[PDB]
Design a protein around this ligand. Structure first.
Ligand SMILES: O=S(=O)(O)O[C@@H]1[C@H](O)[C@@H](O)[C@H](O[C@@H]2[C@@H]3OC[C@H]2O[C@H](O[C@@H]2[C@@H](O)[C@H](O[C@@H]4[C@@H]5OC[C@H]4O[C@H](O[C@@H]4[C@@H](O)[C@H](O)O[C@H](CO)[C@@H]4OS(=O)(=O)O)[C@@H]5O)O[C@H](CO)[C@@H]2OS(=O)(=O)O)[C@@H]3O)O[C@@H]1CO
Ligand SMILES: O=S(=O)(O)O[C@@H]1[C@H](O)[C@@H](O)[C@H](O[C@@H]2[C@@H]3OC[C@H]2O[C@H](O[C@@H]2[C@@H](O)[C@H](O[C@@H]4[C@@H]5OC[C@H]4O[C@H](O[C@@H]4[C@@H](O)[C@H](O)O[C@H](CO)[C@@H]4OS(=O)(=O)O)[C@@H]5O)O[C@H](CO)[C@@H]2OS(=O)(=O)O)[C@@H]3O)O[C@@H]1CO
Ligand SMILES: O=S(=O)(O)O[C@@H]1[C@H](O)[C@@H](O)[C@H](O[C@@H]2[C@@H]3OC[C@H]2O[C@H](O[C@@H]2[C@@H](O)[C@H](O[C@@H]4[C@@H]5OC[C@H]4O[C@H](O)[C@@H]5O)O[C@H](CO)[C@@H]2OS(=O)(=O)O)[C@@H]3O)O[C@@H]1CO
Ligand SMILES: NC(=[NH2+])NCCC[C@H](N)C(=O)O
Ligand SMILES: [Ca+2]
Ligand SMILES: [Ca+2]
Ligand SMILES: [Ca+2]
Ligand SMILES: [Cl-]
Lengths: 451, 451, 451
C-alpha cells in the first residue's frame, strides 16, 4: 500500500531552466517525462529565498524563522545546526517503517547530533556543507596539499565526500556520483520489504560553474560561456534522473513511488540561471527568489499531463508526505504547511484565503513577501509595501497598492502578527553579519511592517 | 472538606472606587457585603502595575519578569503567550479534582496551547484579548462589516465572544453577560460533586467607558461625564457580584467558598478612576499603580468585619489557594509568593522582613518599587531612589531617604540581586517598543539600581 | 579497585609560587613531596583566566562559554548559577558509588538548586561566594554588627561558613579550617566502604592578603610585605596538604588515591604572586593568566619523579576522572576535554593537533588564546593576532606571525568556527558589565577573529 517517496532538490535551479517550466535552450528530457506523465506546479514556493533556511523548512515543515534557522550556517564551519527537537520528515518516516536515504548536499549541521544519520536517514552519501567542487581530479589534490601542510580549516568545497560518516574517494563528476548512489540506494531498497524515502540533494547547478565537456557539447547553440556551462550542469542532473528512473523501473518501484522534483530557491542570474518570467533571482523576495519549478509524479495518483495553478509551499511536503505514508503528526510539532493532497485532488487552492510568507534579512532591514490567492505583497529595498495581482502580472510590474489600501495593510498586519514567535537567529553565515544584527537592534520590524 | 474558590478581578478598578475601600460617590452594596462579612486588605499589591503581566503573575504565582511576560501582548495579535511550562493555578487545582472555570478577559495568549482550555479551565466564556467593547448592538455590526470585506486582522475589542473555542452571539451588556455565565458556571458545579475554581475576569471598568443608562441613573449627583459613566460600569460589576452570591446561596455553595475580589492594577485617573489616598495610578510604581482593593470572604474561616493591615501580594494567591485545596506545590515551580494563610490567621505580616517588588519598563529606563514592613522604596521618572514610611505617609509625600541611607541602599541592592534571573521579554505590546528595547540595550539596570 | 580522587585547587596561585614549579623563595615541602613522587605538568591550562568560569569548567568538563558562565557571578549576590543540566563530575561520581565532598570556595551559585549538596557532593564545608576573610576574630564581629542592624545584602567575605546548609562558627584561620575538614572528610570516608571524591577549594592565596605570623616567620629573607604575607598564605596551604597526606596514610587511602593539585588561574602580580617565566598574570590570555601549576600523584599509576611536557587542559579532568572511576560519560554532555590517561601513560600529547582555548571578555572586545602543539596564538589589547613558538619562547617575546601567516589564520578561523555554540552570558559580575555588553553588541567577534 504505502508509497515510496523521492524528493529531488536541485540547488539554485532557475525558474526557466527545465523544459517543463519553459526552457527554450536547456533541454531536460527525463525531467520533462516526469512532468509530462505527472503534474507540474506553476505557483510553487520555497520557505526562504536561499539554501540553508529553505532546506531546514523542507525537512522540519516549519518556517526557518520559527526555529532560529533564518540564515545559512557559518561558511567556514561551526558546531551548530537545525534544532534537534524539530523532527525531520525523514525521522518521522523512519519511525513509520521507511528505509531512508539522503544524498549530496546537507547544509543543516555537521556535528554528530545534526548529521543525516542522526536526523532519520539510514543512508547518507554526500558532503555536509553548502556546496562542493564537481571534479575529484581538481579538488582531491588541493585537499591533499592543504591537509599535508597541517591546515585544519579546509574549505568545505574540497573536503572528501562521506558515506555514513566514513570518508570516501570519489572518482566521478559529483552529479554523476550522486545519481549513481541514488541507483544504489533504490537497489538496496528492493531487499528491505518496507517502503523508502530518498532525499536527493544535487548541488547542481550551484556554483562553481563546472560541467563535463560531453554535456556542454549538447548545447552548441548556447554561445554565452556561463550559460553553456550551466546548461551542461542541468543536463547532468537530467541524465541522473533518467538513470534513477531506469533503476526504479527495473526494480518495479516506479509505479508506487511519489517523485517530487524542485529547486531549493531561485536561480542566480549572474551565475548562468534564467528565472523568466519572474523578476530578480536567488535571495530576493521578488518571485524570482522563492518561486521555483516543481513537479509531482506518481502514476494513477498524481494526474498525468496537468499543471496545478494554485499556491503550494515547500512546507506542505512534510504533512503531505506524512499523510500519504500513514505517519501521524503531532500538534506540538507546530507544522507551518498543510497536507495539500485533498485540495490538490479537487484542483482547489490548498492555501485558500491563507498567506505564504518569505522574510529575508538584510543589513539593518528585512525584505518580505506575502502570497495569498491572487495577491502578492512585496517589501523590498526599503521601498513602501507594493501589491501585485500575481495571476495577471507575474513579473511584478504593476503595483496596485494605491487601489487596495485596506487589503494590503491587512496582509502586512497579519504578517506582523505571525512574526512574534520568530526566534532570534541561532547563528549567521558570517561573524560580521551577527555583529551587525546586534548593532542594528534587529529585527527592525518597525520598518518591515510599517504601513 | 475542600473549599470552592472564586477569584474576581476587575480591570483598572481605582483604589477608592468600591465602598469598602473608601468610595464616597460610587456605591457597591453587594461587594461591600462580602467585605463586611469578610476581611478587606489595606496593603494588597499586584505584581505589575498593568494588566497582562499582573494576570500572568496571578495565574503562575511568579513575577512576570521571571517568565518573560513583563509586557502586554502585541495589541494586534500574536502567536505568543505566557509560557506553557509555568503551571497555572487553574491547572494545578484541576489536577487536584477541581471543576474549573474562566470568564471574561484573558490577555495571556490566544493560540491553542495558550487558550484557557489548555491552561486548566474546563469552562471558558469570554474574549481572549486586552479588553472589549461592552454593547453587542455596537460591536457585532462592525465585526460583520469587516469580516464580509475579507479582513483577517480585526481589532480584538469587536470580535465575537467564545465558549470553549466556539464563537457565540452575545446579546447582553458584557458585564451582565459575564455575571450570567458566572451563575451558569456555579449552577453547573452543583452536579459535579467536586469543589470548583472560578476565575471571573471583568473588563469593567477598563476603557472604552461604556455604561448602561440604568446604572448611570443611580448616580445623579456625579456631574462629571466620565466619572458617571465609570460609576455606572462599577455598579454593573456590583450587580453581577450580587447575582453570583444569590446563586451561591441558592446552591448552598456560599458558606464553603473562598471569594477573592480585587483589581488587576490601579485606576486610570484620566478615564474616570479615583485612587485616593494613593499617588498616581495605572502603570505607576507609586502606590496608585499596583496597590489595589482586595477582600477575602469565607464564613468561619476568614474573620468577619476585619481589615488586614499587613502587605499581601497577588503572588500569594497561588500557594495560598493551593494549600487550602490540598494541592501540592513543587520547589521547581519557583513560586515567588507565599502561603499567606498561617500569618493571616495570626494577624501577622506574611511578608515579615521580605520585599514585595514592582518593576515597570519604560523607554530606555525602568521604574521600580520595593515594599518591606513599614518601608516603600521608589524609583520613578529617572529621579534618585526615594524612601517613605508608607504606614504614616501613604500618599508618598515625605522622602526620608536622606536619614535612612544604609537601609535604602540595602533594599535597592537586594532588588538588584533579585533582578539577575529576570528573563529578556519574550514579546512587547508594540513592534516599536521591542525595537527601542534592543536599541536602548535594555534593561538599563545600571540606572535602575544606582545608589 | 576504583581509586579515590582528590582535586585540590588553590585560588590565584602564581606559576612560580610552589617549589616543584620553580619557586626559589616560597617553600612548599609537602606539595613538593607529591610532585617528587608523582608527575608535574609544565603545560597545564585552565579553561578561563579567572575563578568562576574556570571552576565551572573543572566541574562540568565544558568551556564556560558553552554554558553561559563566561563571567564571575554578580559580586553582591544573585539567584543564578552554573546551569543545573550540566552534570558536575561530583554528581557523576556520586551516581557511580563515590562518597563526595567539597570544601572551601564554591563560586558556582548559592541558590538551593546550585548548592554543592544539589550538585553531587554529600558533604560541603565552606563559603559559597568568590572568597572570604581569613580570620574569624576579624569577620565574625563585622557580620554580627551588620546582621543586628537588619542588613540583608551582607558582603559574602564576612558571612558565616556552613556545613551542608547549616551555619557554623569557625574558630581557625580559614586555610587551617579547610585542611582540618579535609582530614575529617577522609576519616569519615574510611567507614563508607566505597571510594571517595574530595574537591578541596582553598581560597589561599587569593585576596585579602592575610597570613598567620607563624607562617610569615618562615620567610625572614622575603622583605616585601605583600610577598611575605603571600608566602605565608601558600605555606599554610602546604601545611594543610601535609596534614591531609598524614590522614590518608593513617587511613591506608594514600596509595589508592589520585591527588591532583593545581591553581584555578594565574597569579595576580599586584597581590604578591610570581608567574615566572610567564608573561602577565590573572585574567590575561598571555600564558600567565591561564597556564597553571599542576601535579598528579597516584603511586604505581602516575610515574614518580617525572615532568609531563605536553598540553593538558583542566577540561580533561572530568572525562579522565570518569574513566578512572568506571563512570560512563554520555555524548550529549558535550564534554570539551579528553580522557588524557591513554596519551599520558605513553608520554604523548593528549591534545595532538587539537587546540586549547582561552577567551576572556573585556569592555567592547575580547582577548583570546589558542594553544596547539608548539604554537601559541594570542589576541590581546585589540592588537593584531600574534603567534609564538611557545616551546622555545615561553615568555611570548618573539611574534612569528609574519612568517607563519597561513597557520595563524587557520588557527583563528578554527577558533571562530568553535565560537558559534558559545551561549550569550547568563549573567555578569556587575550590572554595568551587562549593560556595556548589550550597548557594545557583544560579542564583537568581528574584531576578535579578524585576520
Ligand atoms: O555583510 S554579510 O551579511 O556578511 O554578507 C553579504 C550580505 O549582507 C548577506 O546578507 C548575503 O547573504 C547571502 C545569502 O546567504 C549568505 C550569502 O550567500 C548565500 O549564497 C551563497 C553563495 O553565494 C555561495 O557561492 C560561493 C561561490 O561559489 C561557491 C561558493 O564559494 C566560492 O568561493 C570560494 C573561495 O572563497 C575560496 O577561497 O576558494 C574556492 C576555490 O574553489 C572558492 O572559489 S570558486 O570555487 O573558484 O568559486 C564562490 O564565492 O555558496 C554558498 C553555499 O556554500 C551560498 O549558496 S547557498 O547555499 O545559499 O544556495 C546567499 O545568497 O551575502 C553577502 C556576501 O556574502
Ligand atoms: O510607544 S510604546 O513604547 O509602544 O509604548 C508607550 C510606552 O513606552 C509604554 O510604556 C506604554 O505602556 C502602556 C501600558 O502597557 C501597554 C501600554 O498601554 C497599556 O494600557 C492599555 C490601554 O491603554 C488600552 O486602552 C485602549 C484605549 O481604550 C481601549 C484600548 O484601545 C482603544 O482604542 C480603540 C481604537 O484603537 C480602535 O481603532 O477603535 C476602537 C473602537 O473605536 C477603540 O476605540 S475606543 O472607542 O476608544 O475604545 C483606546 O486607545 O487597553 C490595553 C488592553 O487592551 C491596555 O490596558 S491594560 O490591558 O494594560 O489594562 C498600559 O498602560 O504605552 C505607550 C504607548 O501607548
Ligand atoms: O565592572 S566592570 O567595569 O565591567 O569590570 C572591569 C572589567 O571590564 C572586567 O573585565 C574585570 O573583570 C574582573 C575579573 O572578573 C571580575 C573582575 O574581578 C575578578 O577578580 C576578582 C577579585 O579582584 C576580587 O578581589 C577583591 C579584592 O579582594 C577580595 C575582593 O574584594 C575586596 O574588596 C578586594 O577588592 O575577588 C573576586 C572574587 O571574590 C574576583 O576574584 S576571582 O579569582 O576572579 O574570583 C577578575 O579579575 O573587572 C574590571 C573592574 O573590576
Ligand atoms: N599504566 C601506567 N600507570 N603506566 C605508567 C607507569 C606505571 C609504573 N608502575 C610506574 O609507577 O612508573
Ligand atoms: Ca541554493
Ligand atoms: Ca488593567
Ligand atoms: Ca582565582
Ligand atoms: Cl563567549
Amino acid at each position: 500500500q504505502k508509497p515510496n517517496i523521492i524528493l529531488i532538490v536541485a540547488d539554485d535551479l532557475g525558474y526557466a531552466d527545465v523544459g517543463f517550466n519553459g526552457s527554450k535552450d536547456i533541454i531536460t528530457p527525463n525531467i520533462d517525462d516526469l512532468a509530462k506523465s505527472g503534474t507540474s506546479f506553476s505557483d510553487a514556493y520555497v520557505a526562504h529565498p536561499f539554501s540553508g533556511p529553505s532546506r531546514a523548512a523542507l525537512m522540519t515543515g516549519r518556517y526557518p524563522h520559527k526555529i532560529g534557522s533564518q540564515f545559512n550556517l557559518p561558511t567556514r564551519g561551526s558546531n551548530v545546526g537545525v534544532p534537534t527537537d524539530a523532527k525531520f520528515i525523514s525521522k518521522l518516516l523512519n519511525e513509520n517503517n521507511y528505509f531512508t536515504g539522503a544524498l549530496g548536499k546537507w547544509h543543516m549541521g555537521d556535528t554528530p547530533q545534526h548529521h543525516p544519520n542522526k536526523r532519520g536517514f539510514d543512508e547518507y552519501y554526500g558532503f555536509l556543507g553548502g556546496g562542493h567542487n564537481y571534479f575529484p581530479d581538481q579538488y582531491q589534490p588541493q585537499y591533499k596539499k592543504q591537509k599535508a601542510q597541517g591546515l585544519k580549516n579546509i574549505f568545505e568545497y574540497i573536503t572528501p565526500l562521506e558515506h555514513n560518516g566514513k570518508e570516501v574517494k570519489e572518482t566521478q563528476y559529483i552529479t554523476d556520483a550522486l545519481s549513481r548512489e541514488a541507483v544504489n540506494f533504490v537497489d538496496k531498497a528492493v531487499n528491505k520489504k518496507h517502503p523508502f524515502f530518498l532525499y536527493l540533494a544535487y548541488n547542481a547547478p550551484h556554483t562553481p560553474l563546472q560541467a563535463k565537456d560531453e554535456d556542454m557539447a549538447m548545447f552548441p547553440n548556447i554561445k554565452n560561456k556561463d550559460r553553456k556551462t550551466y546548461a551542461g550542469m542541468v543536463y547532468a542532473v537530467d541524465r541522473g534522473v533518467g538513470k534513477l528512473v531506469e533503476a526504479l523501473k527495473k526494480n518495479n518501484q516506479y509505479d508506487n513511488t511519489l517523485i517530487v522534483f524542485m529547486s531549493d530557491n531561485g536561480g542566480k542570474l549572474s551565475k548562468g540561471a534564467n528565472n523568466f518570467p519572474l523578476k530578480a533571482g536567488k535571495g530576493s523576495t521578488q518571485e524570482g527568489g522563492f518561486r521555483v519549478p516543481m513537479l509531482f509524479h506518481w502514476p494513477k495518483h498524481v494526474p498525468a499531463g496537468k499543471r496545478f495553478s494554485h499556491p503550494v509551499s515547500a512546507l506542505d511536503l512534510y504533512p503531505t508526505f506524512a499523510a500519504l505514508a500513514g505517519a501521524k503528526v503531532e500538534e506540538n510539532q507546530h507544522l507551518d504547511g498543510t497536507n495539500m493532497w485533498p485540495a490538490f485532488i479537487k484542483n482547489e487552492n490548498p492555501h485558500k484565503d491563507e498567506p505564504i510568507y518569505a522574510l529575508r534579512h538584510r543589513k539593518g532591514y528585512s525584505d518580505a513577501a506575502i502570497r495569498m490567492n491572487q495577491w502578492k505583497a512585496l517589501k523590498v529595498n526599503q521601498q513602501p509595501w507594493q501589491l501585485f495581482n500575481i495571476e495577471n502580472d507575474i513579473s511584478e510590474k504593476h503595483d496596485v497598492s494605491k487601489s487596495n489600501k485596506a487589503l494590503l495593510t491587512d496582509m502586512v498586519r497579519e504578517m506582523e502578527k505571525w512574526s512574534w514567535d520568530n526566534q532570534q537567529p541561532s547563528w549567521f553565515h558570517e561573524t560580521t553579519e551577527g555583529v551587525n544584527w546586534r548593532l542594528d537592534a534587529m529585527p527592525r520590524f518597525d520598518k518591515t511592517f510599517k504601513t
